[PDB]
Amino acid sequence: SPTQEGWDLTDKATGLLELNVAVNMGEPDNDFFQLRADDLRDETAYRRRIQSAA
Amino acid sequence: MQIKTKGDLVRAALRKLGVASDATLTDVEPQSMQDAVDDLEAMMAEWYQDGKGIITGYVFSDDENPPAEGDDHGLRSSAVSAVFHNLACRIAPDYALEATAKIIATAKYGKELLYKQTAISRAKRAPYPSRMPTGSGNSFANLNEWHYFPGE
């Protein structure tokens, strides 16, 4: 708020001003990965791939 | 080996048939040699069924390089006898001949020996079916949580 010094303050009455900011979001962070069925690694590695993704 | 060209294979086949050789007072015409080279190319192409037949290392000539004769056949030292014996058998009818029993037997034996190692290589077993369990004995499979074989 402002502040004025004096006794007579005719036509010196101020208004009110309140400022604001905006918060937003970007884009998702993904871990798209495929799982070939005909490969031995299909169950050997996908769990730990999930953990490494986290 | 002294047989390093398609023309050399044709000459060996003609020598085996008894038609033309280094010692004969008469020789075959260059047109006949070209026709025999064409017959050899046709036979080799029929054998090598675009990679699904008899693998021999035969190198097919191209039209850009004019003379088919003079190209190295690329065959290994163990296939030359079979190739030229079957070539003699194939080009026998041109001269109203008939390949003799020994030549026919050698051609059959050579073709069998040509396909022997390729057949050994292709005799492969298919993997486990898609519905076959891995079993509890395979502790790696049990701990990695794949209880059934992938297949295909």
Curated annotation (Swiss-Prot), chain A:
The record marks W7 as: Involved in capsid stabilization and maturation. It comes from the Viruses. Transmembrane segments: none annotated. Coiled coil: none annotated. It is found in: Virion. Belongs to the P22 phage major capsid protein family. Interacts (via N-terminus) with the capsid assembly scaffolding protein (via C-terminus); capsid proteins and scaffolding proteins form building blocks that assemble to form the procapsid. Interacts with the portal protein. This is Major capsid protein. It comes from Salmonella phage P22 (Bacteriophage P22). The gene is 5. The chain holds residues 55 to 108 of 430 of the full protein.
From Swiss-Prot, chain B:
One of its GO terms (biological process) is symbiont genome ejection through host cell envelope, short tail mechanism. Keywords: Degradation of host cell envelope components during virus entry, Degradation of host peptidoglycans during virus entry, Hydrolase, Late protein, Lyase, Viral genome ejection through host cell envelope, Viral penetration into host cytoplasm, Viral short tail ejection system, Virion, Virus entry into host cell. It comes from the Viruses. GO terms for molecular function: hydrolase activity. It is found in: Virion. InterPro entries: Gp4_sf, Tail_accessory_Gp4. Tail protein that binds the portal ring and functions as a head completion protein. 12 copies of gp4 form a structural ring at the bottom of the portal ring. Together with gp10 and gp26, gp4 is required for stabilization of the condensed DNA within the capsid; perhaps by plugging the hole through which the DNA enters. Plays a role in ejection of the bacteriophage DNA into the host cell at the initiation of infection. Functions as an exolysin that catalyzes the cleavage of the glycosidic bonds between N-acetylmuramic acid and N-acetylglucosamine residues in peptidoglycans. This is Head-to-tail adapter protein gp4. It comes from Salmonella phage P22. The gene is 4.
